[PDB]
Amino acid sequence: GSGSAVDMFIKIGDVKGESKDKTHAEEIDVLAWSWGMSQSGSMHMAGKVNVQDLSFTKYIDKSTPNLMMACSSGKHYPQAKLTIRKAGGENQVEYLIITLKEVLVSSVSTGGSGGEDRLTENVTLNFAQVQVDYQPQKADGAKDGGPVKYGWNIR
Amino acid sequence: LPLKTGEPSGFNPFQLPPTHANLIFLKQFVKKLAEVTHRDEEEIDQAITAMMSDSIDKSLRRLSLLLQFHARLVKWCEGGDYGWLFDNPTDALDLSTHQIYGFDITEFLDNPEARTPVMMYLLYRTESMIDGRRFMYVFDEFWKPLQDEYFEDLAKNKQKTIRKQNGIFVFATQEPSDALESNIAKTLIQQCATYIFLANPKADYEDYTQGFKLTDSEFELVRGLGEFSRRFLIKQGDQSALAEMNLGKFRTIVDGETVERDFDDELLVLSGTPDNAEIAESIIAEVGDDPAVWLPIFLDRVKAERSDVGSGSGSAVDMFIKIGDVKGESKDKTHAEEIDVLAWSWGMSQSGSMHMAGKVNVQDLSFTKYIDKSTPNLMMACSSGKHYPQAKLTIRKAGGENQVEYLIITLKEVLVSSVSTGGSGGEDRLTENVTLNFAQVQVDYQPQKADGAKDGGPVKYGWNIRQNVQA
């Protein structure tokens, strides 16, 4: 077989990676994802939520000073798109698709002081509207589909 | 005694035995210049003996003046030949503890000046000093230092003297055009007892049956031997056969074990050039004369490095600097030996949104180095707020140590504002930090691929940070 590895690729505008995998042909590839949702208006003391900005750790893309010019200029990319499949096979069911709109870069990491010898870069972003498509991520290869969604706004 | 800098890569003469300094300086001068008035050169030898009779071995100016009243001119030059016969001691007899040495003939390619008088005097020294043990004198490309019948008369008289005194001569030279072109080599072949056809290289043939008197089958074998198996053919007396050194032989302890091919201590014989350079540099900086008291651990280090990699030198990291007076400890082409830095970690952030011309994020930029050498210049630039004219730093991942750097970043008008220093009982190597601002970033991020490909051209972020959004 091919092993046991998750399958995650993303495009955000003309930002692209140096990845060489089977489904990651110079795609952006990530090592960590970090965003959760929160709604402080709950009775335990419409869309009134606490602010939640998105974040991740990615492998090194070929367009990083373009991202820094986007940060210092306020330039957003109009769309970010993700596909994440569970481990067990690279060409399995696309267990998750994510679509992000008005994708402005919030932060970059990893270059400067001596804290990270070879570590991947955290990048944080903001948004206007995000929607996902979840296929059932059972610990399997070929598994039943049917996307369950949410699409949600910055409001 | 290999080719090196202008240290003693040769051996000199005593130059003042007043019964034989005349003949020593006469032969040394004629083999140094090879062209005189041919009148009262013994008076020149006696006058330079009386002039060097102050204590010993005076300046080249005094030597050339006493010799005159092109050899004087080239001794005044001394280009790469500090081991000549004048103003020096005999480094060969400073090896009287272990009289085992040899010469890189790269300087002794230049007859008559560097080649002839040092070699003729040292052959005189080793031949006249009959220590009673065996003697061995080995040659390769004999004809370039030896262009005079002086060596033929030497081989007739003093070589036959030391032939009863355990002396042997090992002429392992090149292709036989060299030997057939010198009648001195013909006289030597008339006294050379055995002949080793070590290889069949690119070499001139079919006069090789002349003088040596090979048969057709013998000449067929010495041409069909080859040079890569490193086996040979041997003729002595009037007879010959194919032979070898058993380079495939190995320690057959029980039933035929691991084929070590006797490769341990063969690196002395093989002499691989970067490992020879490492062992030679560590020995030469270690001790002047070279007994094998530090050599076994150097052989174990050479075996470990050769089993690791052949001249790899890591090729994994590159993080180096030059900020005013400091510089890098760089294995890359940029700097050398001074200061390494730790790693690559900083960024910038933005909290705002335009999607329901950036935001002002008051930030500093920082960097961590190791223990410094140029402490007070950085101290002055830190306290006074002095902007260095540049701060250049080199970043490159694995994929080669001499490749183009993955990010070359020069910050501009680097005022210095804080440096963390430290120290402890456990501070084997203190790291320190500069956290600072400046006028301009000049980031040059090259999107170099993993295989050494640099598609495409590097992306620059060369913008003012001081009071301006950076494009």
Curated annotation (Swiss-Prot), chain A:
Its main location: secreted. One of its GO terms (cellular component) is extracellular region. Induction: Transcriptionally repressed by RetS and activated by LadS. Pfam families: T6SS_HCP (PF05638). The keyword Metal-binding does not apply. GO terms for molecular function: identical protein binding. Keywords: Secreted. InterPro entries: Hcp1-lik_sf (IPR036624), HSI-I_assembly_Hcp1 (IPR053165), T6SS_Hcp (IPR008514). It is found in: Secreted. The keyword Lyase does not apply. Belongs to the hcp1 family. Hexamer. Three hcp1 monomers form two closely related hexameric rings with a 40 Angstrom internal diameter. ATP hydrolysis by the first AAA domain of ClpV1 is required for Hcp1 secretion. Required for assembly of the protein secretion apparatus HSI-I. Actively secreted during chronic infection of cystic fibrosis patients. This is Protein hcp1. It comes from Pseudomonas aeruginosa (strain ATCC 15692 / DSM 22644 / CIP 104116 / JCM 14847 / LMG 12228 / 1C / PRS 101 / PAO1). The lineage of its organism: Bacteria, Pseudomonadati, Pseudomonadota, Gammaproteobacteria, Pseudomonadales.
